[PDB]
């Protein structure tokens, strides 16, 4: 004791003595809940009334800790906060509070008699504060608070910082915690009833603030201004004030960056490369400057006067453009605590899914032809937004009807019913050939599906129905055909690199550009019944040309028809497509129905249909490009010029880029604004010269401003938390990687992610049998430390807890995380690893590196050092991994790496599309199962989308305590492995022996090290930082490589690098080695493109001869964002002594050695060139195997 006095705290290295100390102090916090109370709330802490220091840019700031009385002494629960209607059929129309209100946690009690109106209500509000407030990603909400504060102790080497006083002033009541969460009951259980009801969400808010200090956004002085705003924002309702302020508070950067005037920024080309830098003036146009007056008057009224005085400070004291970036990162973390927003779904139902009328009323088209029911068949607009929208979309009708004829729609629908056989044709013949089918789907209600999201209200999305989706299936099929005929929308696969934003880094660098970005997220309410009729005129004009003989239950037949100008019914030949599209438009019931435990069944108003599914994402995609591009044709008809360059319809955004004179670009950008008004949408574009705004990204002058408040480490939407360590530790590597370029100090995310896995993810519990219990504890204690529990006579098994050896976080096949320097026997330390280190099989080098390698090359020994690794606890950590006790991870869960994509329009269309491929790969897997070779479900192509459809549709409890049973079998394995155990080396580890000696020659930097030195490309890379200098050495990123992997990801759906351990290979080689004629049936089952069939069929011939030789590593695309993906980029940074060209012909392998060592050492790299030093046993291993066996992916 204590953490801030530890040897690790001062040297930030792992010696033999300082690793055990930090391994002990985290074992005491992860276990005892007495030691955690005494860690956070300890009396030695001296409170801070007033504090002084520097803000994000270095200017000095003075703040004061002020906690309001209304949080400390809450009001008693007032039933008028959540009023009902007179008939008590729903919450009152106007009502202020959609979320918790701040009241004394004991003031809420239901004394009413059961099964009354008010009893059900107070049962739900009691369920609101006790249940909905529980969201935690890793461990108990208190263990997530220690991990944040424990890292701040170690980082700053003090216990005195302002964030720790809030923790003591708020959550310290008596000698126990005010509240705690019980996983059995899935609730928060209040000890002190006098505590405020909203504090359970301030445990998560102190975590997201404490994450912002370690992240390097906020300082300790800005931590006060941030936490005083949150405490201010909670009265009466905490989340209701954030949502009201959130826009006001973040929009000042436009004005602050106007006063900066000139700024020098990089210049990008089309091709994702930096071609130079440029000095531009950031002064905004007059029509932008006029909006700064209305915002000053608004920010003054609404904002907390201490936080408003911080914004007024960032507009003045900002000097260059980087200074504006550093304040906008802080002002964004002051308005957002990162938690997912939750209510009772019938409190938030009003303001979300309830339709609204805005601007102008849309009007009907003239009906040129109609059904005998007077249902419209073909129709046309007189003038208005309709005619503008059609003057564009009507040019695609005869191109689409060609493509809608080529499809087979009955076979298209079987592929939907099957992938989400002769059995299924009896179903389709019974269900869908009857006219009664149309009747069943009109009578069916529409359920209300909601999905939570951070810093925004709960969002209503539409799930997949069998009956309701069948009415709109035919318009969807016709509608999605435009995606191939246009550039106007991004449905493509997302790379995750800067390749994704690479097209808006080009236009922010261009000259004479006006940049419009509209937020369309709230549109689906603004759509009315008459607004959808702009899309129907597009579909009914395509369906009149399309001829499909049958789409059940519709036939092509001569139908009586009325026309305009003819007084009697005509007769036309009306095909089954334009019977099916005409009935979908004429019968429209939009309104969803949610069934509430309080009010029974609640039904929404008729207007608004949510945007979730692929079918109504095309409705919103086609309608917008129809209005915005069709307006461009209307201008040329008026004699006016058209300056619009491009349009991208993203999921929640519309991004227009105009280029021209300031007079033209404004007059055109205004008329596109009035045409979305005349169509009934109330929206305001953000017009900006040098900045363009989207979700989770901000691109300003060819740079990138990442939003780090949208990656929530400490909370989840699912609350699927279980005892699964492998899936959890993999989920943490996905988040930490996702913050690397959104954060100003990645060296702080490594210490914060270490105390998460040290405290939160540490302990693991298994259930031994009664007879084997004392035999297990005796064998494992030689390596792992354990805690025994009393034996219960009422059961046949006993629980016992296992706290992991701390080195398990760093081990290759277990959890794997960037290491701190360990200490060799020599006294020298291994290199401190960066966030750029490559996971996977590359992590086994840490064993040979601590061994060390430099002594192994000289002594010509391949023998690992068993004595040290046992002292740091690597042996017990590798033994734990060998036993396979921890929970397995599917290949399907791996398919979600959890980068958050830029456009969600492709997330929608991915659900219902590409059916013929997911069917053909379904035929293959079954027909192959019959032949005697069965494939695991995770490998088959369409199975990833099938599980997420069915599994989310179950309400069965997923909450079960995770306890693994040690039976006679596994206990038999424990005794074996734990006796003689010494770490197991494989022959392929000879590739892990190589060393780099630092030479005296400095290396030429790339010419774009200069262009990126003025205004930085991202928060983590600024001039001199670790992300900049690595970008100066290895220039990113390879365009023709990222185009190649997105052509492969366009079949399999996702890209994963080849490996001989990949379960796709393993089972593929079983077929190859036994029955070769089934490979064609195997390659369709997994839908490998013609390129991957070559990579496999070669590796089968290498794996037959040589076994498993490859040198494997994992670098995520989100991890390396601007940096290069191609190892050849390091060819110039290392010299190879010429005597290795004679013996070994593998040059491209020495580049992967050089590439991974340079990314790993960049924190320590001063710019000198290296020299490769190879082990004699490495050379002799490489020249007994062809290089193609080591690098099967690459083409030599």
């Amino acid at each position: 004791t204590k953490l801030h006095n530890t040897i690790f705290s001062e040297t930030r290295k792992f010696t033999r003595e300082s690793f055990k100390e930090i391994e002990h102090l985290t074992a005491r916090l992860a276990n005892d809940r007495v030691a955690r109370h005494d860690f956070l709330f300890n009396t030695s802490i001296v409170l801070i009334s007033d504090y002084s220091g520097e803000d994000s840019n270095g200017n000095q700031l003075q703040a004061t800790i002020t906690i309001p009385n209304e949080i400390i002494n809450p009001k008693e629960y007032d039933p008028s906060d959540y009023p009902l209607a007179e008939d008590e059929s729903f919450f009152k129309q106007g009502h202020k509070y959609d979320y918790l209100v701040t009241f004394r946690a004991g003031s809420l009690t239901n004394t009413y008699e059961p099964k009354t109106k008010m009893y059900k209500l107070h049962a739900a509000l009691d369920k609101l504060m006790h249940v909905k407030q529980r969201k935690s990603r890793f461990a108990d909400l208190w263990r997530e608070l220690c991990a944040v504060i424990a890292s701040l102790d170690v980082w700053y080497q003090t216990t005195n910082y302002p964030l720790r006083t809030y923790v003591k002033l708020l959550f310290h009541k008596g000698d126990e915690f005010p509240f705690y969460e019980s996983p059995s009951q899935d609730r928060i259980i209040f000890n002190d009833k006098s505590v405020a009801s909203i504090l359970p969400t301030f445990v998560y808010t102190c975590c997201q603030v404490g994450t912002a200090i370690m992240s390097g956004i906020l300082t300790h002085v800005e931590s006060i201004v941030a936490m005083n705003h949150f405490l201010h924002c909670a009265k009466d309702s905490y989340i209701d004030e954030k949502l009201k302020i959130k826009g006001i508070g973040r929009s000042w950067y436009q004005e602050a960056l106007h006063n900066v005037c000139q700024a020098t920024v990089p210049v990008w080309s089309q091709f994702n490369e930096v071609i130079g830098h440029r000095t531009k003036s950031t002064s905004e146009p007059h029509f932008v400057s006029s909006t700064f007056i209305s915002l000053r008057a608004k920010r003054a009224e609404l904002l907390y006067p201490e936080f408003n005085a911080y914004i007024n400070r960032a507009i003045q004291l900002s000097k260059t453009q980087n200074d504006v970036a550093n304040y906008y990162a802080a002002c964004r973390a002051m308005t957002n605590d990162g938690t997912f927003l939750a209510t009772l779904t019938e409190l938030s139902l009003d303001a979300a899914v309830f339709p609204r009328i805005e601007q102008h009323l849309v009007t009907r088209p003239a009906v040129l032809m109609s059904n005998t029911r007077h249902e419209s068949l073909k129709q046309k607009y007189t003038n208005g937004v309709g005619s503008i929208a059609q003057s564009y979309l009507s040019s695609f009708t005869d191109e689409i009807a060609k493509r809608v004829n080529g499809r087979h729609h009955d076979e298209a629908w079987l592929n939907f019913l099957t992938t989400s056989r002769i059995v299924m044709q009896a179903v389709f013949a019974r269900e869908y050939r009857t006219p009664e089918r149309i009747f069943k789907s009109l009578k069916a209600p529409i359920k209300l599906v909601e999905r939570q999201q951070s810093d925004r209200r709960q969002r209503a999305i539409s799930g997949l129905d069998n009956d309701r989706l069948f009415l709109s299936f035919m318009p969807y099929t016709i509608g999605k055909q435009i995606y191939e005929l246009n550039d106007n929308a991004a449905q493509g696969k997302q790379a995750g690199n800067a390749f994704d934003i690479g097209e808006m880094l080009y236009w922010t660098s261009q000259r004479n550009v006006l940049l419009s970005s509209i937020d369309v997220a709230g549109m689906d309410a603004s759509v009315t019944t008459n607004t959808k009729d702009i899309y129907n005129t597009f579909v009914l004009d395509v369906a009149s040309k399309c001829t499909v003989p049958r789409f059940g239950p519709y036939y092509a037949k001569n139908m009586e028809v009325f026309e305009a100008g003819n007084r009697q019914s005509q007769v036309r030949y009306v095909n089954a497509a334009w019977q099916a599209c005409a009935l979908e438009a004429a019968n429209s019931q939009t309104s969803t129905s949610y069934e509430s435990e309080i009010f029974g069944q609640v039904k929404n108003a008729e207007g608004t249909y949510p945007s979730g599914r692929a079918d109504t994402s095309t409705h919103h995609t086609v309608l917008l490009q129809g209005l915005v591009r069709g307006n461009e044709l209307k201008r040329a008809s008026d004699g006016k010029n058209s300056c619009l360059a491009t349009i991208k319809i993203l999921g929640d955004d519309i991004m227009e880029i105009f280029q021209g004179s300031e007079s033209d670009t404004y007059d055109h950008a205004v008329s596109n604004a009035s045409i979305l008004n005349e169509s009934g949408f109330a929206t305001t574009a953000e017009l900006s010269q040098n900045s363009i705004v989207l979700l989770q990204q901000l691109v300003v002058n060819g740079t990138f401003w990442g939003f780090a408040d949208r990656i929530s480490l400490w909370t989840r939407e699912d609350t699927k938390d279980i005892g699964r360590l492998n899936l959890a530790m993999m989920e943490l590597n996905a988040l930490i990687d996702d913050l690397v370029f959104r954060v100003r100090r990645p060296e702080g995310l490594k210490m914060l992610g270490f105390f998460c896995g040290a405290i939160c993810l540490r302990r693991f519990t298994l259930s031994v049998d009664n007879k084997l219990y004392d035999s297990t504890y005796n064998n494992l204690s030689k390596y792992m430390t354990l805690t025994k529990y009393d034996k219960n006579p009422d059961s046949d098994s006993t629980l016992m807890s296992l706290i992991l050896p701390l080195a398990w976080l760093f081990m290759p096949r277990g959890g794997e995380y960037p290491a701190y320097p360990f200490e060799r026997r020599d006294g020298t330390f291994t290199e401190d690893e960066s966030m750029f280190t490559a996971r996977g099989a590359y992590k086994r080098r840490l064993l040979y590196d601590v061994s060390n390698i430099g002594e192994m090359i000289q002594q010509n020994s391949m023998a690992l050092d068993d004595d040290l690794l046992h002292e740091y606890g690597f042996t017990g950590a590798l033994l734990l991994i060998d036993l396979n006790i921890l929970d397995l991870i599917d290949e399907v869960k791996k398919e979600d790496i959890s980068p958050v994509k830029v456009s969600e329009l492709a997330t929608s269309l991915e659900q219902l599309g590409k059916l013929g491929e997911r069917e053909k790969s379904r035929r293959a897997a079954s027909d192959l199962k019959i032949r005697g070779h069965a494939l695991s479900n995770d490998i088959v192509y369409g199975y990833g989308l099938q599980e997420k459809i069915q599994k989310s549709a179950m309400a069965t409890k997923e909450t079960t305590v995770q306890s693994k049973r040690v039976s006679s079998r596994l206990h038999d394995v424990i005794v074996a492995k734990t006796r003689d155990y010494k770490i197991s080396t494989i022959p392929a580890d000879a590739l892990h022996l190589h060393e780099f000696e630092v030479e005296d020659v400095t290396v030429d930097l790339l010419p774009h090290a200069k262009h990126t030195s003025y205004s930085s490309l991202a928060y983590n890379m600024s001039f001199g930082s670790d992300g900049w200098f690595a970008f100066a050495l290895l220039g990113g990123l390879d365009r023709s490589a990222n185009l190649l992997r997105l052509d492969v990801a366009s079949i399999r759906g996702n890209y994963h690098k080849f490996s001989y351990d990949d379960p796709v290979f393993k089972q593929g080689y079983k077929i190859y080695k036994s029955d070769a004629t089934l490979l064609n049936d195997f390659f369709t089952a997994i839908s490998a493109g013609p390129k991957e069939q070559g990579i496999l069929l070669r590796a089968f011939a290498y794996y037959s001869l040589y076994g498993n030789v490859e040198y494997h590593y994992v670098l995520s695309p989100r991890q390396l964002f601007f940096l290069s993906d191609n190892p050849v980029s390091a060819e110039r940074l290392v010299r190879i002594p010429p005597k290795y060209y004679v013996s070994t012909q593998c040059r491209a392998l020495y580049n992967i050695f050089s590439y991974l060592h340079i990314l790993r050492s960049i924190a320590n790299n001063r710019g000198k060139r290296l020299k490769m030093v190879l082990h004699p046993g490495l050379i002799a291993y490489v020249r007994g195997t062809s290089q193609g066996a080591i690098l099967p992916e690459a083409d030599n």
Partner: protein, 498 residues
């Protein structure tokens, strides 16, 4: 045929199709009745499904296939010998009527064969199949129309009871004709409905009614207003709208005719509202009905709430389409209006003046339109320019939620204490979907009227009525299910209560 004519004949009796007595085409109706029996036995044998339907489709329809373990092919070989014994030179074409009630009665074992076959589709003109078709000519009798001039003994014309089936259009009771002129051998085709032809402003117009000709009290020469309310409930006009039907229309002709079938799409949405009326889970149950202005909806729906109250037993309220317009014309000034249901229902009488008719009357005089004759001379671009100026005064009420706003009015009436549980609300245009609420069922109601000829005739409102119709028409596509007045009465009859 899809539905076996020999077993189900009462189904074909409706369309006017009676079976011949029992001849190379007559033996073919017995063969197809043996093929249906052989299928339904094989179908019910395995879970109600045919095991290899592509064989049955060709064996039956094309007749080109012969077949020769115990589950698989033992059923096909039983079918192969049955069809081989028929010795037909060609198969039997699978026949289906265009009718919607017909297609929904087809057995499931024929639906499995339809995907493999090219079914001959017989068009139905009024809903009665055309007797000029080939397959309806040989298998069924061919009707003969007796009229006033046509009527004589069966011996005059060539007629045999085994060929022609008499259709009595003469208006004299079938007992007379059968007994007096010697038709006692012939079988009369009986129609329970009526078909009328009215004179009209633009020409001749036809109307179908679900009332028998003795129930409906009308003959040739009788006026449109006589027996109006019977026609309003049960009538449908088969001519393109606008039809010329006005109050001075007279009957040119009457004939008995097949009763119409209520659309299964309307009875599906109407029975979605009757599941809310019954269910104890739902608190408030509202039905939103849209109609063109001048279609006679409040005359109908007021008597729909009577039939819905008597069958259910619950109390049913009715808000007329003008309930909000007339309420606001009073309470627009009062800063705390009374939303009590029985109060709104009092202002809802026809003698009150709506608010929108006051704002629209000022809008007309400002353009100088004092008379219906003047509004007819205006150009279309000129009318729509005036109507866009009503759309600006219509948004004012819907655009927000206030004490006087339209969203609030229907909110305080529907959520009141003393307001009935179930309501019926009438909207003018689709933009009120977000205002009059909150429902999973909303329909659009068509009647027998020319709504532009009704607002032209009434001498009270005059222009202001005709101008508001066209304004609302312009805002009201048919985007919701179309329901006729007799389909809402048939929807209650088919629903089973308690």
């Amino acid at each position: 045929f899809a539905i076996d004519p020999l077993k189900h004949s009462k189904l074909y009796e409706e369309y006017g199709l009676y079976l011949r007595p029992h001849a190379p085409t007559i033996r073919s109706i017995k063969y197809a009745s043996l093929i249906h029996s052989m299928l339904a036995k094989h179908a019910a044998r395995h879970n109600g499904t045919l095991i290899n339907p592509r064989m049955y489709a060709d064996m039956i329809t094309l007749g080109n296939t012969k077949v020769t373990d115990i589950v698989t092919y033992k059923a096909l070989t039983e079918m192969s010998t049955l069809i081989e014994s028929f010795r037909l030179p060609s198969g039997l074409a699978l026949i289906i009527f265009d009718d919607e009630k017909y297609q929904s009665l087809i057995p499931n074992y024929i639906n499995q064969l339809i995907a493999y076959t090219q079914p001959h589709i017989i068009p139905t003109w009024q809903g009665i199949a055309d007797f000029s078709d080939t397959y309806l000519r040989s298998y069924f009798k061919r009707p003969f129309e007796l009229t006033a001039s046509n009527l004589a003994a069966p011996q005059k014309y060539n007629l045999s009871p085994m060929t022609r089936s008499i259709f009595n259009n003469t208006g004299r009771e079938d007992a007379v004709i059968r007994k007096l002129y010697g038709y006692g051998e012939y079988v009369f085709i009986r129609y329970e409905g009526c078909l009328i032809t009215w004179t009209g402003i633009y020409g001749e117009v036809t109307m179908m009614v679900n009332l028998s000709k003795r129930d409906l009290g009308l003959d040739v020469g009788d006026d449109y207003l006589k027996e109006y309310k019977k026609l309003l409930f049960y009538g449908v006009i088969t001519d393109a709208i606008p039809s010329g039907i006005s109050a001075r229309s007279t009957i040119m002709k009457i004939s008995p005719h097949k009763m119409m079938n209520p659309s299964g799409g309307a009875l599906a949405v109407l029975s979605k509202f009757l599941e809310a009326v019954v269910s104890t889970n739902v608190i408030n149950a509202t039905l939103v009905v849209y109609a063109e202005k001048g279609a006679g909806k409040t005359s109908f729906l007021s008597t729909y709430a009577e039939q819905l109250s008597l069958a259910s037993g619950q109390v049913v309220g009715h808000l007329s389409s003008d309930a909000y317009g007339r309420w606001l014309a009073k309470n627009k000034d009062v800063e705390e209006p009374s939303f009590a249901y029985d109060y709104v229902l009092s202002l809802d009488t026809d003698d009150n003046e709506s608010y929108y008719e006051q704002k629209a009357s000022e809008l007309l005089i400002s353009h100088g339109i004092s008379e219906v004759a003047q509004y007819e001379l205006l150009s279309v671009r000129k009318k729509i320019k005036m109507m866009d100026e009503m759309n600006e005064v219509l948004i004012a009420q819907l655009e927000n939620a206030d004490t006087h706003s339209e969203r609030n009015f229907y909110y305080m009436v529907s959520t009141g204490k003393t307001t009935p549980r179930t309501l019926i609300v009438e909207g003018h245009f689709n933009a009120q979907d977000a205002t009059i609420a909150r429902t999973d069922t909303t329909v659009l109601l068509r009647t027998i009227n020319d709504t532009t000829q009704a607002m032209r005739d009434r001498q009270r409102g005059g222009v202001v009525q005709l101008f508001l119709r066209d304004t609302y028409y312009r805002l009201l596509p048919a985007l919701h299910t179309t329901v006729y007045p007799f389909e809402m009465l048939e929807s209650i009859r088919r629903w089973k209560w308690v």
